[PDB]
Amino acid sequence: TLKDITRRLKSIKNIQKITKSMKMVAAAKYARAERELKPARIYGLGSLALYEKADIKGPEDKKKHLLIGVSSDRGLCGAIHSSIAKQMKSEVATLTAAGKEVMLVGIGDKIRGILYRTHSDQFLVAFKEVGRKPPTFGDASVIALELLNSGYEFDEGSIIFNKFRSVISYKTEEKPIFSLNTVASADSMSIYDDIDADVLQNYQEYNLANIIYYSLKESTTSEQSARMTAMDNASKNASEMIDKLTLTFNRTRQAVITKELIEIISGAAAL
Amino acid sequence: PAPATTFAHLDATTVLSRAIAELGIYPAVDPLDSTSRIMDPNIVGSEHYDVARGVQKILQDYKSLQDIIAILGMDELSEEDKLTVSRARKIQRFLSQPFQVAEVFTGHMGKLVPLKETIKGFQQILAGEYDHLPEQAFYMVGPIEEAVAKADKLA
Amino acid sequence: QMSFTFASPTQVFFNGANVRQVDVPTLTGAFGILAAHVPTLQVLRPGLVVVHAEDGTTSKYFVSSGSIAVNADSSVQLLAEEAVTLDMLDLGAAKANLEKAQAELVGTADEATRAEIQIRIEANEALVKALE
Numbered sequence: 001t002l003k004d005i006t007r008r009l010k011s012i013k014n015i016q017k018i019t020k021s022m023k024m025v026a027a028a029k030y031a032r033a034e035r036e037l038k039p040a041r042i043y044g045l046g047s048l049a050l051y052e053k054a055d056i057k058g059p060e061d062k063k064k065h066l067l068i069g070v071s072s073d074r075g076l077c078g079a080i081h082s083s084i085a086k087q088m089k090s091e092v093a094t095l096t097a098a099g100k101e102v103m104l105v106g107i108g109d110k111i112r113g114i115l116y117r118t119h120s121d122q123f124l125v126a127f128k129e130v131g132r133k134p135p136t137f138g139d140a141s142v143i144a145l146e147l148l149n150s151g152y153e154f155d156e157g158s159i160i161f162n163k164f165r166s167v168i169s170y171k172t173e174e175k176p177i178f179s180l181n182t183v184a185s186a187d188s189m190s191i192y193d194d195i196d197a198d199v200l201q202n203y204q205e206y207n208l209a210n211i212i213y214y215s216l217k218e219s220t221t222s223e224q225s226a227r228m229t230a231m232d233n234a235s236k237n238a239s240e241m242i243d244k245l246t247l248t249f250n251r252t253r254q255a256v257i258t259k260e261l262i263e264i265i266s267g268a269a270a271l
Numbered sequence: 272p273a274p275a276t277t278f279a280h281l282d283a284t285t286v287l288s289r290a291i292a293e294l295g296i297y298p299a300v301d302p303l304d305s306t307s308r309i310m311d312p313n314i315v316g317s318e319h320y321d322v323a324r325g326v327q328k329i330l331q332d333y334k335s336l337q338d339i340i341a342i343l344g345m346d347e348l349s350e351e352d353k354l355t356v357s358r359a360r361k362i363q364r365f366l367s368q369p370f371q372v373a374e375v376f377t378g379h380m381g382k383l384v385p386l387k388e389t390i391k392g393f394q395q396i397l398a399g400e401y402d403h404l405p406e407q408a409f410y411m412v413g414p415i416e417e418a419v420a421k422a423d424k425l426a
Numbered sequence: 427q428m429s430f431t432f433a434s435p436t437q438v439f440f441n442g443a444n445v446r447q448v449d450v451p452t453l454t455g456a457f458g459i460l461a462a463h464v465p466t467l468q469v470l471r472p473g474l475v476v477v478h479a480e481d482g483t484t485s486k487y488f489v490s491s492g493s494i495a496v497n498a499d500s501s502v503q504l505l506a507e508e509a510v511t512l513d514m515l516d517l518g519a520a521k522a523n524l525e526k527a528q529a530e531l532v533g534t535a536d537e538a539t540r541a542e543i544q545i546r547i548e549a550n551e552a553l554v555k556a557l558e
Contacts, residue, residue, distance in 0.1 A: 015342065042441060043433040046503040050467060050495045075347060082346055117350070137435035137507065191498065193466035194454060202453065202469040206493050210505065213435060230344065237342045 002252050009245045016238035022076070023231030026224055029134075030167070033221040036134065037164065044214025047207055051178070056186045058156050058178050063100045066157030066177070067091060068147075068212070069115075070219040071108030072131030077223050078230035080162055081110040083172045087160050088115060091174070092122065103152060107143065107216065124150055135220055140213035148205060155179050161215040162222035168229060170222040175211055180204050283307040295410070296367040302330050319386075322393050326362055329397070333359035354399070357406065361396055364409035365418065382413030391415065427461040429501045432477065432487075434509040439487065440477065447478040448502065450494045451552075459496055467495040470506065472552040486512055488556060490549065517557055524550040 069088045071081045088104070088111070095102045104123045106112040112126040125146055130139070157177035162170045180201050183189055278284060285305045292299035312320040332355050336348070340356065348356065371381025384392075392415035395401060401419070408422035430448065432440040447460045451473025470492045477485045489506035496502045527546040534540050 012338075012342070019343075036436070039433070039436060039438045042431070042438050043435055043505055046431045046433050046505055047493070049431075049501070049503055050497065053497045053499070053501070076343075078344070079346060114350070191465050193464045194468065195466070199454065199468060203467055203493055206469060206491075210493075234343050241338075241342060 002249070002256055005245065005249045005252055009242065009249065012238055012241050012245065016235055016242065019231045019234040019238065023228055023235060026228040026231060030221070030224040030228055032134065033224045034164075037217055037221050040214060040217035044210060044217070047210040047214065048175070051176075051207075054186070054188050054192070056178055056183055056188065058176060058182050062155040063098075064153065064155045065095055065100045065102045066105065066147075066152070066154035067095075067102055068105045068107065068157065068159040068177075068215075069111050070159065070161040070212075070215045071106065071111035072220070072223050073109040073128055074131045074223075074227075075110060076227055076230060077110075078226040080170075080219075080223050080226050081108070081114055083162065084111050084160055085114045087172050087174065089118070091158070091160070092119065096122075103154070105147065107212075107219075124152055130216070131220070131223070135213070135216040137209075137213050140209050140216060143212050144205065144209035147208065153179070155181065159211060159215050161219040162226075164218050164222040164225065167225050170226060175215065177208060177211060178204070283309070294363075296363065297373070297411075298368065298370070300366070302327060302366060303334065318394075319390055322390055322397065325397050326366075326393055329355055329359045329362060333363075354402075357402065358396065358399065360406045361401065361404075361409055362393070364406055365392065365396060365412070365415075367409075367411055368413070369411050379411060382417070384414050388414040388416075392418070427500050428459075429499070430477070431501075431503045432475075432509070433503075433505050435507065437509070439485075439509065443479075445477055445479050448504070449474070449476045449478075450504065451475070451489075452494065459494070459502055461500050463496045463500065463502075465496055465498050467493065469493050472549045472556075474512075474556045475504070475506070475509075488512055488515070488553075512557065515553070515557055517554065520550055520553040520557065524554060 067088060069084050071084050092102055092104070102122055104115065104119055106115060106126040108130050109128050116123065127143060156179065158174050159177060160172065160174045163173035164170050180197065183204065184197060184200055189195065283306070286301045287299040288301040288304070289299070291301060309315060310320065310323060336352060336356060339348070345353070345356070368384065369377065369379040369381050374381050395415060404419065404422035405425065408425060409418050412418045412421055428445055430440045430443045430445050447458055449456065449458045450468070451471050452468040453471045454468065456473065470489055472490045473488070475487045475489050477487070479485070488510050490508040492504065492506035494502070494504045524547065527543055527550055531540065531543045531547060534543055
C-alpha cells in the first residue's frame, strides 16, 4: 500500500538520520578522545615502565585473583562490550580451571549486565556513570579506593580494556596487576633503594590507580571510534533499505495509477 | 480476487512463499501464513498445539526483529533477543525437509518424518536443548537425530 | 645521561629530557636525583620539585602527591597527581585553609577524621611554606 509504504519509509528515514547525527557526535568525541590520550598514554606507560624494567613476573603458585574489565554505560559501540565480555569469560574459565578463586569487577554498566547473569557469585563491585563524560583521574582514584576498601586482598589481578590502535582498529588487551607481596619478594627488587613494606604498599596503591586511569583513557577513545564506525555502517544499511523501499514505492504508485485509470474507463464505457 | 476468494473454500491452506524459497528453504511453506481447522488443542492434543504455537510465536518475534537486525547490527540486541534469534533461525532451517521427488535435482535422500519425531524435535529446539550446534546443522535434514548426526559430522 | 619523564594525568611537562638534577619531596624525606642515581622508587608528599636543566636554569613546580622512580638505566619517571606551577597559587587562600583545618583538628575527636584533618593540614602547611 502506498500509504503504509510511505509510513515505513519515513520510519527508516528517521532512524537513518538519527544514526547520522549520532555518528557525527561520536566523531566529535573521538576528537578530544585521541588528544587526551597522548599525555595520558605517556603517563600510564611511565607508571608501568618500572614493572617492565625490574621484570616482575608475579606468582604462579597462588589462587586469589582479581579481574577488572573496563567498558562504558553506553551501547551502540559495536564489538566493544562483547569483546571485553569474551576476554573476561575466557580468562575466568582458564583461571578457574586451575582452581584459582577469581573475583570480578566491571567498569561500566554494559559489561556488568553482560557478565552478571552467567557470573554473579564471582563478583565484588561494579561501577556506572562511565562513558558520558571523558574520564579523569578522580574517577580512577574513586575506583582504586573502592577496590582497596573491599575486604578482598587479591594476590594477583589483571585489567582488560580495549587498547586503541587506530580509528578503525582496536585490540582487547590485558595488563597485569601485582600485589605488595609480589613486588616485595621479587628478588630483582633487591636493587631498589630505601624500600620497605610501607613504601611499597603506597606505591602499589598509587600504581593501581594509575593503571586504572590509563585503561579508562584508552577504552574511552576505543569506544568512541568504534561507535563512529558502527553508526556509519548503520547509516549505510538504512540507506540501502531506503533504496529498496523506493523501488517498491514506485512499483505501488504505478499500480495505483493504472488501477484508478481502469476504474474510470470501465465506469465510463458501460454507457 | 481469485486466491482471496478461494481461501474461504479450504479446510487447510499451505502458503508457499518466494521470500522463503530464496533463502534456500524447501518446502517454501510460510509458517506464519498457513492455517488449519484442526489446529485445535481438543483435536491434535494439547502438546502438539503448544509446540505449534511456540514455533509460530518465536518465528513471529524474529520477523519483528528483522529490521533492527538488518540496520542496527546483530550485536545490539538483548541477550534474550539473541537467544530468540538463534533459536528462530534454527527452527527456520529445521522446518525444511528433503523430498523423495526432489532428489533428482538435489541429490539428497528424501525423508519422511513421522508426527512424533516432529513434535519431539520442535519441543527440544524450543527448550534450547541444542543451542550449541550451529544452525547450519538443521538445514535439509530428516528428524532431529539426523540433525545432531550432521552437527557431529560438521567436524 | 638522565632520561627524565615528568608527567601528570593530563599534561606532560618533560619527556625523555636530559636534565642534571631533580629534587623531589619524597614521603620519606626530600632527596635529589642526578644521573646514575641508585635505583629506587618512592611516593611523594606535597612539595616543591625543582628540575635543573643542563644549562643551569631551574623549573620549580609543586606536586601534591605521586610517585618517583629512578631505574638502573638512569631513567627517571616522575608521575604527579596534581602538578601546578608555583604561580597558579596564592598565600592567603593557603593560610585560610590552614586555619580552617587547624580549627577542625582542635574540634575533631575521631582517629579516622582526625588523621584526615591532619593530612589536610600537612598539605596546607607544605603549601604555605613552599610558596613563600
